[PDB]
Design a protein around this ligand. Structure first.
Ligand code: HEM
Ligand SMILES: CC1(C)[C@@H]2CC[C@@]1(C)C(=O)C2
Ligand SMILES: [C-]#N
Ligand SMILES: [K+]
Ligand SMILES: [K+]
Length: 405
């Protein structure tokens, strides 16, 4: 379904890419997006899909636009337009300097000191989950680890019952990879309706959990409102329940096909943080964007006020101008260039938690289950959206080649 080409967009810039169903998806989702970086595609193109919008395809442009909030506003950060307009999460839907005081509060609840505090629980849970799976000789990695590991850690940090995971995960997925069953607004509304009474309770009787801390924080000299707290907590849920989950699956899928990469990390685990960065580059998975605040000429292209521009975080590190042989996983790259956690003022608040979860997973999985593979004749399907994902990842292994610690 192609929207009529706006008069200001010249035809040579048209490239009808569908971010929710890219044509080359069967080759892998990153590969499907990388079609935007072939020699036939300009640096900045207009797709008529999904209501019509720009797509920047090169790291330089993506970084520049994410820095220039004056022209590229986060007030409407999702495609399609109806989703972007309904989007009111905090701090993401705010530009500097307004986002600042809310972002400071986000850092308080998901930032570094919180990770270096929950680290024992993170380590504990990874070991527990992996040891439980180890003697089976198989698992569906998405449901058996990729979901419960980061999600249970998030529910712990937020003080929310694990029994609510299925419902919350469903709603989160509707916002990033919609199925058509409900509008963005309806999904966001269901999430908000869940949070509303919980926020009320925790303003009545504060705990030390993330929701309590947000709901009782302060902005420009005054208490945060219940509305503001809801809008921030909603974003924390979306951010805690989707990205790391899917990232872990892309990474484990790769490791399942790459015995030599597994051994690099097992033999020299001090390389694990660098490997984490390289996997974050190669299997980058987010693509949101911004809205034009005014008419603006950007790299020779006339953008109009109100035009949406997708600035795919995924693409920067896949750009061969940023990394040579970008589709090759090389743990020894002298610089792993990427914007996987975003760029500019909205650079991911949870990136430290994410990295810790990834690094713990790499170490603890490979220690106990050093040799595994994708199940014979299994077809792995990826899905694409604001956050791209892995549908299922059936893994197999010989339990005789595993180790308890
Ligand atoms: C591999 C894992 C992750 C990736 C790839 C990722 C990616 C991103 C990206 C690209 C953005 C910027 C979006 C924009 O500029 O519009 C962002 C923002 C954000 N993320 Fe993550 N993220 C990850 C993990 C997490 C985790 C574990 C949390 C914990 C709740 C989290 C919470 C947030 C929050 C609260 C923001 C908003 C920050 C702001 O607007 O100032 N993320 N993330
Ligand atoms: C694009 C994101 C990854 C970022 C955090 C969660 C997410 C889906 C948002 O709505 C902002
Ligand atoms: C962030 N997700
Ligand atoms: K291009
Ligand atoms: K909006």
């Amino acid at each position: 379904n192609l929207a009529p080409l706006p008069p200001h967009v010249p035809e040579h810039l048209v490239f009808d890419f569908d971010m929710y169903n890219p044509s080359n998806l069967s080759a892998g989702v990153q590969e499907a997006w990388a079609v935007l970086q072939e020699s036939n595609v300009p640096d900045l193109v207009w797709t008529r899909c999904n209501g019509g919008h720009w797509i920047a395809t090169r790291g330089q442009l993506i970084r520049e636009a994410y820095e220039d909030y004056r022209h590229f506003s986060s007030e409407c950060p999702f495609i399609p337009r109806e989703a972007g307009e309904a989007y009111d999460f905090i701090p993401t839907s705010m530009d500097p300097p307004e986002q600042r005081q809310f972002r400071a509060l986000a850092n308080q609840v998901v930032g570094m000191p919180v990770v270096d505090k929950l680290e024992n629980r993170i380590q504990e849970l990874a070991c527990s989950l992996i040891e439980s799976l180890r003697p089976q000789g198989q698992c569906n990695f998405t449901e058996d680890y990729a979901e419960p590991f980061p999600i249970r850690i998030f529910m712990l940090l937020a003080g929310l019952p694990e029994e609510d995971i299925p419902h919350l995960g469903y709603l989160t997925n509707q916002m990033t990879r919609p199925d058509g069953s409900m509008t963005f607004a309806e999904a966001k509304e269901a999430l908000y309706d869940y949070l509303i009474p919980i926020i009320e309770q925790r303003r009545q009787k504060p705990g030390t959990d993330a929701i309590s801390i947000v709901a009782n924080g302060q902005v420009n000299g005054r208490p945060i409102t219940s509305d503001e707290a809801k809008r921030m907590c909603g974003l924390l849920l979306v951010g805690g329940l989707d990205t790391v989950v899917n990232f872990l699956s892309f990474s484990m899928e790769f490791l399942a096909k790459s015995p030599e990469h597994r051994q690099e990390l097992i033999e020299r685990p001090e390389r694990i943080p660098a490997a984490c960065e390289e996997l974050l580059r190669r299997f980058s998975l987010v693509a949101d964007g911004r809205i034009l605040t005014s008419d603006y000429e950007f790299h020779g292209v006339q953008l109009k006020k109100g035009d949406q521009i997708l600035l795919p975080q995924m693409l920067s590190g896949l750009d061969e101008r940023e990394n040579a042989a970008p589709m090759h996983v090389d743990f020894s790259r002298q610089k792993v260039s990427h914007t996987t956690f975003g760029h500019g003022s909205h650079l991911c608040a949870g990136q430290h938690l994410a990295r810790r979860e990834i690094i713990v997973t790499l170490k603890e999985w490979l220690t106990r289950i050093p040799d595994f593979s994708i199940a014979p004749g299994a077809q792995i399907q990826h899905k694409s959206g604001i956050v791209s994902g892995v549908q299922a990842l059936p893994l197999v292994w010989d339990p005789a080649t595993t180790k308890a610690v």
